[PDB]
């Protein structure tokens, strides 16, 4: 929701900018979401992906996806149309931020005694930012499939 760190120190400035980079990637991606040969027929490479995207946009459809991957990291979800798709939760940054990082931060008004926490956060935060950057330079469609997209 908000970064209210009032006390300024080299450590606070480090977590705050690291927090801001994460808070920026979410908003940044959220912005993105709203011879011969001449005879060869023309195709639509991502018509299949576009169709799947369109179903996920349907009302109450994401909840179906979220609730199936709540207990496990692999699930087959039946979309409202009729299609079963393999779903995969790769990073759970939610459970990291809420139960390990945010409590540590609040205790001393953003003064982290162990610099390891910022290093762990920036490492935990790295995969999200790198995925965002590829999408941020390639108009939401990347090819080939990077190792950050799918290990």
């Amino acid at each position, epitope marked *: *929701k908000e970064t209210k*760190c009032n006390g300024t120190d080299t450590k606070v400035k480090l977590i705050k900018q690291e927090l801001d980079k994460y808070k920026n990637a979410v908003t940044e991606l959220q912005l993105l979401t709203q011879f011969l040969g001449f005879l060869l027929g023309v195709g639509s490479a991502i018509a299949s992906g576009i169709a799947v995207c369109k179903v996920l946009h349907l009302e109450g459809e994401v909840n179906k996806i979220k609730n199936a991957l709540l207990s496990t990291n692999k699930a087959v979800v039946s979309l409202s149309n009729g299609v079963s798709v393999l779903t995969f939760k790769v990073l759970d940054l939610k459970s990291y931020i809420n139960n*390990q990082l*945010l*409590p*540590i*931060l*609040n205790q001393q*008004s*953003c003064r982290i005694s162990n610099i390891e926490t910022v290093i762990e956060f920036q490492q935990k935060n790295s995969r999200l930012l790198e995925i965002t950057r590829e999408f941020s330079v390639n108009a939401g469609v990347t090819t080939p499939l990077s190792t950050y997209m799918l290990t």
Partner: antibody
Amino acid sequence: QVQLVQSGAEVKKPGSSVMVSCQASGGLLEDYIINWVRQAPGQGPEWMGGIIPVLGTVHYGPKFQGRVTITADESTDTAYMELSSLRSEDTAMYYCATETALVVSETYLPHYFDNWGQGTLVTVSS
Amino acid sequence: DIQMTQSPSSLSAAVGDRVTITCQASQDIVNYLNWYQQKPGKAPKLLIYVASNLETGVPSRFSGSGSGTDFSLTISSLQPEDVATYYCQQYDNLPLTFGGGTKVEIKR
């Protein structure tokens, strides 16, 4: 560095309802997660519930849901706890304990208690 | 509910000894575990949060360790002002639950 001031100890009749208050000095109620913990004589602490004023959400331990009411009056920086239907089990020292809530995300939950009140001993007897 | 098992229930150690207390969880709580100190008649005091982070103003002799289901609280040199009851506490899910407690006494 914020001092939590609870209401004074008192004797309440069995079956009636008691309210314990907790006054914060040096910060706003919104700036914290406000928890209520009780400890019966000879027992450990037990989590009853907590309030998150920044999100307007309250969470209750299963044993206390439906007969415990926790409120946070931000206009006065006063937190309250209302326990109804008193019985023998409720004789206990009641604590007001906080968790700092500067950077709060959605779906934020109570995690720990870094700042405690002095405790309020409620004795239920006639 | 998640049951927290603190062991032993009581111990007697000399001044200057290294004292270790154990807390066991009924399921994996990663490192979402806190430690508190309660002296007789006083409110509990936060000593260790997130398994290993030392609270400010707490003597350097305190340390916390562990991950998964087993955790420890360590005092490298037990001091007279440490006579109290200690509690572990998880926050993986609600309701928050506490350990049974370990009463530490000084043998002189």
